[PDB]
Structure formats: C-alpha cells, structure tokens
C-alpha cells in the first residue's frame, strides 16, 4: 500500500491588516496532523494528532521558524503578483502553495509535488517528471522562465526526492 | 520535515 504527505500553505492579503492571513496545514495520508494559524495569539506549528506528541521541542522549534519564514515569502510575493497582473493595492488577494511526496509501496518516492495558485486559478506547477514546469498565463510564464534558468526543479527535487520522503517514513513509524 | 524556502516569483 502506497502512502503520501501533503502541505497546504495559504495566504490572504487585504485592506487594513497589512500582514497576510497565513494558514499552513499538512496532511499525512489524508489525515490532518499539523496546523499553523497566523491569527493565533502565538503563531506556531502544533500537532493535530496524538502520535505527533512524541517530537522533541527541537522539532516544533525550527519547524515554526520555517513558517515564520514562509509568512514573509507570501507577504513579499503576494506583492509582486499583484504587480504581474496590474491590480489595485487595496484589493484583497490569495496566494497558495502545495507540495509533498507520495511514496510508493516499496518506500521510494512515487510522485513529487510543488505548485502555486493565485486567487483560485492555477499558476505554476512542477510536472510529474520533477524537471519541467507548466505555466498558466503570461505571468505564470515569467516566473517559469526564470525558475527554469535558476534550475528551480532541481532545488525542490532535492527535497521531494529524499528529504520529504525520509520524513514521511519518519511519521508513518509513529503510528 | 519541511520543504526549503521557495524561489522568488
């Protein structure tokens, strides 16, 4: 039986409240096992299941920083995207990412993931080959030309290939 | 674990 892992990072800029509404939620197989609401009184990745308890504060520590980091990414890119498309600074928008690894039955990766969607509509996504991308429109095209030169694929490939999977296994063993 | 920081858009 082939298992899987998935994370969904969602941002939402708007009027007034400058800093976007960050929502990082991750699923193992198809169950929620970790959340991160920028709206919480104290932002931080927390377990959504008992078997996630067995994790040294070290884990929850840097794992949260990553988040704290993505926040900045979203607040920064949600801006440039509002530019690629020529919209108003006041208008509210949403930038979402998704990634993860789908291990085969033997354990080795069977499918990687990495994709971004701006305001519901797809934008850019890494193909099954983990080597080529697929743009949606003009702007998505842009990001894909530079990402193609900068060898974006290989970058995410490093994770999706080993790192991610070696961890999905690290999780499965807690249950 | 968590995927590294993403490439600028």
């Amino acid at each position: 039986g082939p298992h899987s892992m998935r994370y969904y990072e969602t941002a939402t800029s708007r009027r007034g409240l400058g800093e976007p509404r960050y929502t990082s939620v991750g699923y193992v197989d198809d169950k929620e096992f970790v959340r991160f609401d920028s709206d919480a009184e104290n932002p931080r990745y927390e377990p959504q299941v008992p078997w996630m308890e067995q994790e040294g504060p070290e884990y929850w520590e840097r794992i949260t920083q990553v988040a704290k980091g993505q926040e900045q990414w979203f607040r920064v890119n949600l801006r440039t995207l509002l530019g690629y498309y020529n919209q108003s600074a006041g208008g509210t928008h949403t930038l979402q990412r998704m990634y993860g690894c789908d291990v085969g039955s033997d354990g080795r990766l069977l499918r990687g993931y990495e994709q971004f969607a701006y305001d519901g509509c797809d934008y850019i996504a890494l193909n099954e080959d983990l080597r080529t991308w697929t743009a949606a429109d003009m702007a998505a095209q842009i990001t894909r030309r530079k990402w193609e030169q900068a060898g974006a694929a290989e970058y995410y490939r490093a994770y999706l290939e080993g790192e991610c999977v070696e961890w999905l296994h690290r999780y499965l063993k807690n249950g | 674990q968590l995927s590294p920081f993403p490439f600028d858009l």
Partner: T-cell receptor, first 110, second 109 residues
Framework: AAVTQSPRNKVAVTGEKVTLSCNQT?????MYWYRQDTGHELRLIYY???????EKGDIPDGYKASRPSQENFSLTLESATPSQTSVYFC?????????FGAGTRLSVLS | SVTQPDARVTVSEGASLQLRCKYS??????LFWYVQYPRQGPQLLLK??????VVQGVNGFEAEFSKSNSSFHLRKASVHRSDSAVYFC??????????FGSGTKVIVL
C-alpha cells in the same frame, strides 16, 4: 553582479554610528549582509526576505538593518568599535544562489 | 557546519588541483563553491542542488558530491596562474542562507 555598495571604503571612529548602504538591480527579493574580517569566512549579520523584512543573522549584535525598498538594503553600526572592523559584503538572490557586491572595506579608528 | 581542512594549498602551474570539503548535516543540503579574487566579492563557481553528483563549473572547474563520505570536493584539471585566490565551500539548508567555510588560499608558481 549588478549589486553595488557605497562607499567603496569608509572610516569609522569609535562610538560613531555608521550606516553602510546597498543597491541591487537583480530584482531579487532576498538580500543579505555578510562581514569578512581577515579575508576568511564571511558571516551573515543581517538579511531581508523582502522590502520591509529584517532578520538577524548569526551575529547581529551591535547592528541594525533596514529594507525600505526592493533594492536598497542598509546595514547600520550602532556604535563603531575596533573589533567591528572588516570588509562587509551585501548580497542578493532569488533563493538558491547569492550574488555578492564589491564589498566595503570599513576601518575603525580610536 | 561545513569544514575545509586545508587553509593554505599551493600547486605548480599546470598541475592538477583539488580542494576538499565536508558537511555535517542531518540530510541532503545544497552545496556551492564560491571563489574570491583579492579585493573582490565571492563568485559562484559551481553548484549542486540535485542530480548528477558531478557538477560542471565556469573555467574547467568541477566538483563531486558524495552522501556516503558526505563531501563536496572541488577540482580543476590544469590550474593556470590566474586561478590563484581563495576558495570557499558553502552550504544552505536554512532559508537562502549560505554558511561558508574557512576557505582555502590556492597559490600557483
């Protein structure tokens, strides 16, 4: 290699507050500030994810930073001291790679 | 934490050159090799994100990656006079960081 730093060389007096400036054209979001003492390892002091971000590096003590815009990144020395003298490098990068500038050979005086 | 064993390495003009480098990380990181020419900033010589453990670089420079020995050793077939400078070995498994190593002052003859 379109990241420029000014002045090429600066002379700080003990106590004084010096502010090194940076300017890029790589339209990069991530910018950084490394210091290279005696032509050895450069260490990160401060860096920004984007205009308006300020993240302490591995040695921000005595340092302040500002990211007022896409390309302008300013590193500030609260109060210059001997041990705070070296060649500072300002880099930019769209994740993954980093493009450094010419640097700024800043020297402290007592 | 990256570590370049030799800080001072010199070879005669034309001879081959190899600069070692070891990284102590929980897993597969991103390895680079920046060269710094006196009175200038570091330059990106070559990089390795994922794929061929053998990467190519500007000016007949190439490095090999090994998860087994956990090293990213650099090499150049024939080093001319111009190659003399300091070579750094950086890694990054944090947010676009780039922790360098002590480096290595390569000298020719």
């Amino acid at each position: 290699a379109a990241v420029t730093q000014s002045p090429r060389n600066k002379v700080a007096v003990t106590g004084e507050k010096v502010t090194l400036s940076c300017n890029q054209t790589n339209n990069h979001n991530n910018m950084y500030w490394y210091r290279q003492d005696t032509g050895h390892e450069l260490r990160l002091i401060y860096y920004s994810y984007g205009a308006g971000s300020t993240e302490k590096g591995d040695i921000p003590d005595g340092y302040k930073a500002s990211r007022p815009s896409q390309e302008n990144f300013s590193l500030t020395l609260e109060s210059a001291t001997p041990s705070q003298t070296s060649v500072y490098f300002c880099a930019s990068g769209g994740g993954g790679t980093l493009y450094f500038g010419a640097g700024t050979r800043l020297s402290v005086l007592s | 934490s990256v570590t370049q064993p030799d800080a001072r390495v010199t070879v005669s003009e034309g001879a081959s050159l190899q600069l070692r480098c070891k990284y102590s990380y929980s897993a597969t990181p991103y390895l680079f090799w920046y060269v710094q020419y006196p009175r200038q900033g570091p330059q990106l010589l070559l990089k390795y994100y994922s794929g061929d453990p053998v990467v190519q670089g500007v000016n007949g420079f190439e490095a090999e990656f090994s998860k087994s020995n956990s090293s990213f050793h650099l090499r150049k077939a024939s080093v001319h006079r111009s190659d003399s400078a300091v070579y750094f070995c950086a890694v990054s498994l944090e947010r676009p960081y780039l922790t360098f190593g002590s480096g290595t002052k390569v000298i020719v003859l």
